[PDB]
Amino acid sequence: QLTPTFYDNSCPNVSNIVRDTIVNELRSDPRIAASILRLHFHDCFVNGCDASILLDNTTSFRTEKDAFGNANSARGFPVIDRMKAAVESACPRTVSCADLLTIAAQQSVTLAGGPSWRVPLGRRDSLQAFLDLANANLPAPFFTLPQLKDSFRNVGLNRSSDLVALSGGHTFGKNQCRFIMDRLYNFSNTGLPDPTLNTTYLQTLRGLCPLNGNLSALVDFDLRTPTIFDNKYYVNLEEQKGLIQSDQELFSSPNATDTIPLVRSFANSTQTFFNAFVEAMDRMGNITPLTGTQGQIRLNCRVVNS
């Protein structure tokens, strides 16, 4: 069983070291908090939160960093290396990379103005990476609501609240033009933009992402508060201003009978959202963890111990 007090004796200063690292990095890179939260999400959705995503290539297995959902998208790996080194210095061979990334995600959320809570700990590090599993398990922005629900249920999160609350991670961070080009100019081969995208916002997005333009250009997930972790993400959905297809579907999909009330509830109350986010975050962080003597306490998050 994972417990929040796992390192209270072996490394009581772990959370503080992680926090300090993120604060320092945020000065030069204001996007790092969002990036780190996403790393934890992509870790947990592939064989569980076992730091498998942090492993680099080996001749026996490919890195998950080359998965379609990670390649030229996932970022912040050096920052994780930095805090790991700092933690290793303070508490040698004690904190697993899986736990380190979980704490980093929570601290990132709190630093961005979100809720503060102690995450369950005790996770251990994987002995391999899973590229094929990452390609199969990570959801895509073009997924329909039924597909989004399928993706979450596939890894163990059955509740619509899990999906709606965790999607709130898009209250900050960036998104490449490539992922919304269809919504802007030719959605589902209709030759027309996605009708669920507010027409005024459509104009703004087309200006940021012109046809035949730089597909790698970045746009903010939350037009209201781009870098602040708050419930504004849901207010946007209510106005048909969700950035990617998977965001807006939570409110506009024909299959959204169960998700619409959740979107409204979170848009109406920061407290309701924050409570649900913490609840969902801990549930995601409890996905098939290696514990006890299973796996290792990786010393270098990029490679398995030898």
- Residues noted as catalytic: 42
Annotated binding site: 43, 46, 48, 50, 52, 64, 139, 170-171, 222, 225, 230
Mind giving me the DSSP string for 211-278?
Answer: TTS-TT-EEES-SS-TT--STHHHHHHHTT--SSHHHHHHHH-TTTTTTHHHHHHHHH-HHHHHHHHH
**216 and 177 in contact (C-beta within 8 Å)?**
yes
Rounded to 5°, the CA angle 288-123-85 comes to 140
- Partner whose footprint covers residue 43, from ligand HEM, Ca ion, none (CB < 5 to 8 Å by kind): Ca ion
Of 23, 71, 228, 303, which lies in the binding site for Ca ion, with binding defined by CB under 5 A? Answer: 228
Q: Which two tokens stand for residue 159?
A: 């509740």
In 3D, which of 158, 134, 172, 142 has the Cα closest to residue 47? 134
Size of the site for Ca ion (CB under 5 A): 11
Q: Which stretch binds ligand HEM (CB under 6 A): 60-68, 80-88, 174-182, 262-270?
A: 174-182
Of 124 and 170, which has the nearer Cβ to ligand HEM?
Answer: 170
CB of 12 to Ca ion, least distance (A): 26
Per-residue binder mask for ligand HEM (CB under 6 A), 232-271, x = binder: ------------x-x-------------------------
**Alpha-carbon gap, residue 259 to 241, rounded angstroms:** 16
Characterize the bridge pairing of strands 174-176 and 218-220. Answer: antiparallel
Helix (H, G, I), strand (E, B) or coil at 2: coil
Q: Is 82 an interacting residue with respect to ligand HEM (CB under 6 A)?
A: no
Q: Which stretch binds ligand HEM (CB under 6 A): 52-60, 92-100, 116-124, 139-147?
A: 139-147
**Alpha-carbon gap, residue 64 to 55, rounded angstroms:** 8
Q: Which helix H or strand E contains 175, and what residues bound it?
A: strand 174-176
Of 75, 159, 206, 302, which lies in the binding site for ligand HEM, with binding defined by CB under 6 A? Answer: 75
Q: Which stretch binds ligand HEM (CB under 6 A): 7-15, 30-38, 188-196, 261-269?
A: 30-38
Residue nearest to ligand HEM (CB): 173
Size of the site for ligand HEM (CB under 6 A): 24
In 3D, which of 102, 42, 101 has the Cα closest to residue 73? 42
Q: Is 140 an interacting residue with respect to ligand HEM (CB under 6 A)?
A: yes
Q: Is 231 an interacting residue with respect to Ca ion (CB under 5 A)?
A: no
**112 and 22 in contact (C-beta within 8 Å)?**
no
- Chain contacts with ligand HEM (rule: CB under 6 A): 31, 34-35, 37-38, 41, 73, 75, 139-141, 143, 148, 166-167, 169-170, 173-176, 179, 244, 246
